[PDB]
Amino acid sequence: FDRTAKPVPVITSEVTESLEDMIRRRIQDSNFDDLQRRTL
Amino acid sequence: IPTHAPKYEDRTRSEINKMKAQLKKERKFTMKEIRKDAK
Amino acid sequence: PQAPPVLTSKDKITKRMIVVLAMASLETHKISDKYVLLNCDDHQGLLKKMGRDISEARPDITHQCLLTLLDSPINKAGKLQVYIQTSRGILIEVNPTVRIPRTFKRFSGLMVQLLHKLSIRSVNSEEKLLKVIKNPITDHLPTKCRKVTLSFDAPVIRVQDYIEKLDDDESICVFVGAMARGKDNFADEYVDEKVGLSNYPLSASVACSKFCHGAEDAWNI
Amino acid sequence: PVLTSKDKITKRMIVVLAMASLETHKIDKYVLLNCDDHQGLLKKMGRDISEARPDITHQCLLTLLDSPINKAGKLQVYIQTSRGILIEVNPTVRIPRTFKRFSGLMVQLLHKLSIRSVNSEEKLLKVIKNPITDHLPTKCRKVTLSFDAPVIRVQDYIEKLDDDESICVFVGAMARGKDNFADEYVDEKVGLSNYPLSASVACSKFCHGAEDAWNI
Amino acid sequence: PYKIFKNTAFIKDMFSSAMEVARFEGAQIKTVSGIRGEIKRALSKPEGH
RNA sequence: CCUGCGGCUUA
């Protein structure tokens, strides 16, 4: 039969590992997102 | 002293309990299997 | 007539005493379905793989102490409860209402049922004898108690004189550990005195029976 | 030294166990009587299943091994059984304190009846048949543990006992049975208390009373 | 259907058990009249409802 | 006693 929406996506060691290495980069090159402080 | 005996070591209700256990596990695996395959 | 009342932590200000056993091999080692005990001469691979020693591990010390203690004349006069501090820290309080079998197979089966249960029941379905107070024994015991370690190295004296000198409102307590190789320091911090009864080394069953014989002739128990 | 059954001049305490379960059967090794290992063996031979109480003898042996009186070598242990054999052990006998390891000792005792020790110096267990009055001194008294007699103090009864007068006590190790197993061999009957008292408990209480009345 | 909320219905007569429904949580049912829908969860004490 | 994640099974 068919499906109507996409519910809860199961995570595993591999999905967590993929996001793990990408954030290992994304602080290894120290790029970083923030609120910026307006003067005056 | 009043001696007590050592308490030491029907088919219907545990059938129901592990029937709902069986439906839980099969529904989990078929949910993930078909959602997986469909996407 | 009638038997004496329940001798437990509930019987606190009345005439009561505590027999304390500790440093025994009492746990739940499931053989890979059910729950079994740590036996030295029975299981060779399991005991050696557990990390214990054949001379050190002793699971029948508690069974022997229960066989030599539950049939005491003072115990039928309603004056003693049983407190057990297990190797896993489990504290067990036993009233003298029943008597465990001396058969180490049956006693071990009852102990394994208690280890998988922490719950024993009576035939009359009115008095669950196996109570478990807040651990240790001295956290819910009687409000007037006497604590002493009956060591083979402490001052050896007659059991009649010291027990007769005690008051009827206090609760004399004795700590026994039947280690094949050990020392009288299992409940040293709990005991408030260090006294002796025998001039030769004895197990927990023999020392407990000597203490029971002394208490039986103390206040004619 | 150790007081034995040969020296019948100095008083040696004799503790005789009565009606202890020591039954052997054939599998095909010889197997001792068990109450939780063999169930159909008792129910098919023709006997009952309540006659398997074999741990009482080992319990009395371990309870009288490290006693202060046994440390003095004064207590000699005789044992009589329904099979028709008697066992005699000095207070210096050493056995393993585990019933599974004492199962091998029981098999050795029921298959050889003369257990030379592991040190190979003295046969600790000696097999003797009937009677048992030749193992105590010629001036001896026999006491049976029965509730029929009035309860008397151990120190009071031991104080009137003479120094050469040996004491031969009979402890009933059977879970169920009568106290007249050796009534023709017993002289008088004694008690411990009006409340309950076991067999090995009575033996250890008699050891404590002998320690109190004899400095042991 | 046999019991009707607003934007939620209760369904009889399609299935007969519980694990039948539990095989299908996420199927699509369309009304014969023509609105879309799905099934969401199983009622237990009613046998197939 | 109902019920959310873990054993084993069912047609």
Interchain proximity C41–D201, CB inside 8 Å? no
Q: Which nucleotides of F are covered by protein (CB under 7 A)?
A: 2-10
HSE (side-chain half, CA atoms, 13 Å) at D34: 21
Separation between Cα atoms, residue C203 and residue C180, nearest integer Å = 8
Q: Which amino acid is at C100?
A: I
- Inform me whether the C-beta atom of residue E34 falls under 8 Å from chain A C-beta atoms: no
Q: How far is B33 from chain C (nearest CA, A)?
A: 33
- Inform me whether the C-beta atom of residue C118 falls under 8 Å from chain B C-beta atoms: no
Interchain proximity D208–C203, CB inside 8 Å? no
Give chain B positions within 8 Å (CB) of C129. Answer: 4
Separation between Cα atoms, residue D202 and residue D199, nearest integer Å = 5
Q: Are C35 and C116 in contact (CB under 8 A)?
A: yes
Question: From the centroid of its chain, how far is CA D204?
Answer: 12
User: At A26, is the secondary structure helix, strand, or coil?
Assistant: helix
Phi and psi at residue D88, to the nearest 5°: -130, 130
A and C interact (at least 3 Cβ pairs within 8 A) = no
**Percentages helix, strand, coil for chain D, rounded to the nearest 5?**
25, 20, 55
> How deeply is D100 buried, as exposed, middle or buried, from its count of CB atoms within 10 A (0-12, 13-18, 19+)?
middle
Q: How far is E21 from chain B (nearest CA, A)?
A: 9
C and D interact (at least 3 Cβ pairs within 8 A) = yes
Interchain proximity E28–A1, CB inside 8 Å? yes
Find tokens 């879309």 and name the residue. E36
Interchain proximity E19–B30, CB inside 8 Å? no
Question: From the centroid of its chain, how far is CA D88?
Answer: 8
Separation between Cα atoms, residue C130 and residue D193, nearest integer Å = 27
**A/E interface, count of CB pairs below 8 Å:** 13
Interchain proximity B27–E22, CB inside 8 Å? yes
Q: Are C63 and C98 in contact (CB under 8 A)?
A: no
Give all chains having 3 or more CB-to-CB distances under 8 Å with chain E.
Answer: A, B
Interchain proximity C41–D212, CB inside 8 Å? no
Separation between Cα atoms, residue B2 and residue A35, nearest integer Å = 77
Q: Which are the contacts of C189, defined by CB distance < 8 A and separation ≥ 6?
A: none
Alpha-carbon distances of C54 from C15, C105, C115, rounded to whole Å: 40, 19, 22
Give chain D positions within 8 Å (CB) of C217. Answer: 153
Q: How far is C127 from chain B (nearest CA, A)?
A: 9
Q: Are D75 and D56 in contact (CB under 8 A)?
A: no
The distance (Å) linking the CA of B22 with the C1' of F8 is: 9
Give chain C positions within 8 Å (CB) of B1. Answer: 3, 76, 96-99
- Minimal Cα distance from D174: which residue of C? C102
Beta strand spans in chain C (E): 17-22, 80-85, 91-94, 130-131, 146-150, 172-176, 194-195
Cα torsion D140, D145, D150, D153 to 10°: value is 70
Binding-site residues of D for S-adenosyl-L-methionine, please? Answer: 145, 172, 177-179, 192-197
Measure CB to CB from residue B1 to each of C96, C100, C109 and give the nearest one. C96
- Inform me whether the C-beta atom of residue E22 falls under 8 Å from chain A C-beta atoms: no
User: At C19, is the secondary structure helix, strand, or coil?
Assistant: strand
Find tokens 């009589």 and name the residue. D80
Other C-beta atoms within 10 Å of C164: how many? Answer: 13
Q: Which residues of D178-188 are buried (b: 16+ CB within 10 A; e: fewer)?
A: ebebbeebbee
Q: Which residues of C16-32 are buried (b: 16+ CB within 10 A; e: fewer)?
A: bbbbbbbbbbbbbbeee
- Minimal Cα distance from A8: which residue of B? B32
> How deeply is C221 buried, as exposed, middle or buried, from its count of CB atoms within 10 A (0-12, 13-18, 19+)?
buried
- Provide the angle, in degrees to the nearest 10, between the axes of the packed helices C204-216 and D55-63: 80
How were these coordinates obtained?
Answer: cryo-EM
Binding-site residues of C, please? Answer: 150, 177, 182-184, 197-202
Closest to C97 (Cα-Cα) out of C125, C64, C130, C119 = C130
Q: Which are the contacts of C47, defined by CB distance < 8 A and separation ≥ 6?
A: C38, C39, C40, C54, C57
Measure CB to CB from residue E19 to each of B23, B34, B35 and give the nearest one. B23
Resolution (A): 3.5
Strand F: residues with CB below 7 A: B 18, 20-22, 24-25, 28; E 44
Q: Which nucleotide is nearest to E16 (CA to C1')?
A: F11
- Test mutation, B16, B30, B36, chain E, max E CBs within 10 A: B30
Direct distance between the N- and C-terminal alpha carbons of chain E, in angstroms, rounded to an integer: 9
